[model samples]
Target: KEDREWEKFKTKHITSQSVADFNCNRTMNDPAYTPDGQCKPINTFIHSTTGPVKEICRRATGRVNKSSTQQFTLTTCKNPIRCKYSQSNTTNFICITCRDNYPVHFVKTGKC
Candidate 1:
């Protein structure tokens, strides 16, 4: 009952998605584009010869910011997935500071 309520709350308020699928022109034969998108509500799976290992996600209780002296409250994914994404100077600076303790499942898509 508690889990269901929590799920409902997350669905109603949390902005994260269960998965981030990239649009491609190819058929289902091709690999899905796992680009650098973060705050994905998906579990991390590590595949080895033995099989796949699941990675656990942790909730971020706080954040670290060198730019701001006031209490910085991060209301988004702490460890957002990264790619060669283009953003304004301000966004870049903010992302850099919050770059720590991200989920293992959120793979790095490309170089920054």
Candidate 2:
């Protein structure tokens, strides 16, 4: 029931770098330590067991003069996004399927 409810809400999910930062601050910490905000707790997701998750994406750290920041803007092919465990946050990223749509799969574990 809970998962079903969340799934409904997940259909129109919007997860951006800013939102990620906010969640990190609320649940984790400010300035999040990690260059790209990919720290310990921020990387933790246990499937909710309570609901389904929508699409998730990772933004480049954007560190000045850093090579990683080169990929700041996500590619067009990456649109609609996908979810999986974060390398920085160490959590599961998921996209809930709406009515007739299927959820996209994108789980980035291990090192980047």
Candidate 3:
């Protein structure tokens, strides 16, 4: 279950979906996005590959801010009513949780 959760998490958080083609309601397929698990108010996806993201774990702080102000293009999913979502682009630093030496979950976005 743990590894599977990570798989789902990575597919959701990482795996870089182009903002031009991203669709929140269509993309967020995990059951967690449904009423059974409660709605996620806002979620951000980093427009990057796994290499740089996993490297964050090896940075100075381990699981939080531990590198230079890495600039990234992001797609933000906002769900205010029910599960209807609106997509927006943003620029910022990303935070994440890792396992061993790889990212397994996205924590949030951060400032420089």
Candidate 4:
């Protein structure tokens, strides 16, 4: 029951289909435009064969500001899949901050 509500929240208020497809507006998936869409939600995948992998494989769109403070806060409603992306623009940004003795996933898509 809780998972269902969370999923609904992600789809309705937290995220949208367009945003998912626009993943930080990166060019990885679409070559015609080249980093034109929003930043996609990032996630960490655990696989026995590949080990821990940070990826944008799930969605392709979301939003981000490269020239800004680059501070992102995960609201209580955020799905566990969400991870903050970082680059040179953010001073204190770390690829993955360890928490609960686990390394946070970091997806390094170029800034738009």
Candidate 5:
């Protein structure tokens, strides 16, 4: 159900950039550390199994970049824009279908 819900959203290519930086204030520091040793976590917490955590993590560390011109895919479904799906005997097909009878198949995009 969740995956199907996400699939309902449309996708588009976006040009973006990579803005890379790390927070210096948030760090694990220990005076007992050496080149041969490592810093171990004194306390760890598994916060929540609730909402969109994976999406948040992906946006923060995965394919999402915010600095230079980068190509990214955005998913959405706005007014008059939607995705369509049809099933045949041996194949399933998808396309971007919009109002005014605009229908663009996935074939050219190599998605069929």
Candidate 6:
């Protein structure tokens, strides 16, 4: 019953980006990602497993972040047109909110 955070991780963060894998609109529209038929302005995918991400809680690397900060190779999708997104790749520091040492939320990215 307490799988809320972990399950959310699957829906929001865990992903692989490729020619066919990183479909932002499709991902967000999957019904699981959105509560209803609403549109999300942006989304981030961390191309790693739950292992490394869980470390963010232990590290707490961001004073800029109340939760934690760590470097990651990620894909950020910005919806500029309809459900279509502009995708970009960057390895940068990201802030995350943790619970019971699991990353439950993404606060923001960069400058951490």
RMSD of each: 14.3, 15.5, 3.8, 15.5, 22.0, 3.8
Error of 3 at 94 (Å): 0.9
Q: List model 5 lDDT by residue over 1-112, tens digit each.
A: 3332222221111112111221111211222221212232221111222122223222233223122122113222112212121111111122222222222111111122
- Stretches off by above 4 angstroms in model 4 are 16-70, 73-112
lDDT of 2 by residue, 1-112 (tens): 4344334332222233442342422322223222233223323322221222221213212211111111121111111112222233323223222222222222332213
lDDT of 6 by residue, 1-112 (tens): 2257657765687675563477776776677665424457877777777677777766444332333356778787786487777878788777776565566677877643
* Cα deviation of 16, candidate 2, in Å: 6.8
Q: Which window of 10 residues has the lowest lDDT sum in candidate 3? A: 59-68
Worst 10-residue lDDT window for candidate 1 reads 46-55
Q: Once superposed on the true structure, which residue ranges of model 5 sit more than 4 Å away at CA?
A: 1-41, 58-112
Model 3 misplacement above 4 A: 1-6, 29-39, 60-69
Q: Per lDDT, what order, best first?
A: 6, 3, 2, 4, 1, 5
* Reference-based TM-score of each model: 0.18, 0.21, 0.69, 0.17, 0.15, 0.73
Error of 2 at 15 (Å): 3.0
After superposing candidate 2 on the true structure, give the runs of residues whose Cα lies further than 4 Å from its correct spot. 1-23, 27-100, 104-106, 109-112
lDDT of 5: 0.20
Q: For model 2, give the 10-residue run with minimal summed lDDT.
A: 71-80
TM-score, structure 1 vs. true: 0.18
- Residue pairs in candidate 5 whose N, alpha carbon or C atoms collide under 3 angstroms: 16-70, 17-67, 17-68, 18-67, 18-68, 19-67
- Note the Cα lDDT for every prediction shown: 0.22, 0.26, 0.63, 0.25, 0.20, 0.66
**How well does model 2 score by local distance difference test?**
0.26
> In what order do the candidates fall by TM-score, top score first?
6, 3, 2, 1, 4, 5
Give lDDT for model 4: 0.25
Q: Candidate 1 residues 4-90, lDDT tens each?
A: 432332332222222132111111112222233323433122111111111111222223322222221122222223312211111
Task: Tell me which residue pairs clash in candidate 2.
Answer: 42-89, 43-89, 43-90, 43-91, 45-91, 54-95, 83-93, 84-93, 84-107
lDDT of 4 by residue, 1-110 (tens): 43343233223222222322434323222333222222334321111111111122122223221211232322111122333343111112223322222223232222
